[PDB]
Write a protein that binds this DNA or RNA. Structure first.
Length: 275
DNA sequence: GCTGATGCGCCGACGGATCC
DNA sequence: GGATCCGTCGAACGCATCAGC
């Protein structure tokens, strides 16, 4: 079945107006993505904060269009030092108070997967979580990475509520992908990755914004393989999330999936917060 | 400089068996 | 015997390196 995101709900449940718009997008190669007019779509979305994963692009190679963004002038970029893979970036209208990279030791383990930005009222973390890999050859690493990440997020020294967004590389429940049964030994839907997502929600604690608003809505995915025309058939996975501290839930106006925006094998997701 | 080949990381279609 | 379960296998993308010219 196809999916149609419901209209944008820009008022919190109790009636406050959204004041912060956050967009997150795994662009699957930032230079490719720009050539496929991804920035055009960002300009129309007009977010206050833009989080990108899988940029596959060091900061020296960033196209000049990214400098013709006056509403997103504070730009922070991260690439791993070894490997054209990974990469993440955070662009904000307003200057954040603090920015950091990695989950504990990035200065020696330069991985380019996590950016932390502190604002007045909240802490934003954007993440590109390591893939368990084909044949699960890196699942144990992911399990160990998951545990270091939980503790890092728990260990934030801020009393400020937390927003965690990006590609978490797991479809939490069966509702979150089109072929749950044929994929339970595939990366992204193993019991191990799913349990780690569950423990993230519980340990931090955090709520799945989209699922909190739409607890029973099936067929809502953020990734489709380029292959076999999966996107046209909406054979996809929900791999990209906005996860909120419990305190931020009354502020939650909506969590969107921008199914129709092309340019990657992931589509954008967008958070509306009334702060 | 430029192209395209190969290498690498990132599952749904298919065929066959089992179940009542 | 239609539905379901299970395992195998090919291949769209982007980017780096490399060979050749």
């Amino acid at each position: 079945a196809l999916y149609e995101d419901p209209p944008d709900q820009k008022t919190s449940p109790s009636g406050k107006p959204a004041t912060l718009k956050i967009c997150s997008w795994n662009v699957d190669g930032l230079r490719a993505w720009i050539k496929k007019k991804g920035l055009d779509w960002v300009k129309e979305e007009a977010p206050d904060i833009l989080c990108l994963q899988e940029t596959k692009c060091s900061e020296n190679k960033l196209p000049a269009e990214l400098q013709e963004l006056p509403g997103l002038s504070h730009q922070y970029w991260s690439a791993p030092s070894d490997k054209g893979y990974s990469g993440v970036g955070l662009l904000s209208r307003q200057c954040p108070l603090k920015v950091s990279y990695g989950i504990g030791d990035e200065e020696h383990d330069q991985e380019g997967r996590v950016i932390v930005a502190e604002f007045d009222s909240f802490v934003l973390v954007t993440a590109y979580v390591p893939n368990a890999g084909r044949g699960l050859v890196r699942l144990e690493y992911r399990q160990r990475w998951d545990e270091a990440f939980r503790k890092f997020l728990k260990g934030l020294a801020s009393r400020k509520p937390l927003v965690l967004c990006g590609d978490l590389n797991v479809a939490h429940e069966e509702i979150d992908l089109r072929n749950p049964k044929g994929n339970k030994k595939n990366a992204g839907f193993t019991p191990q990755e799913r349990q780690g997502f569950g423990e993230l929600l519980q340990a931090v604690p955090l709520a799945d914004s989209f699922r909190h608003l739409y607890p029973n809505t099936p067929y809502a995915y953020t990734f489709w393989t380029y292959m076999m025309n999966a996107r046209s058939k909406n054979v996809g996975w929900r791999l990209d999330y906005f996860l909120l501290s419990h305190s931020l839930l009354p502020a939650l106006c909506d969590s969107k999936i921008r199914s129709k925006a092309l340019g990657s094998d992931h589509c954008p997701i967008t958070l509306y917060l009334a702060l």
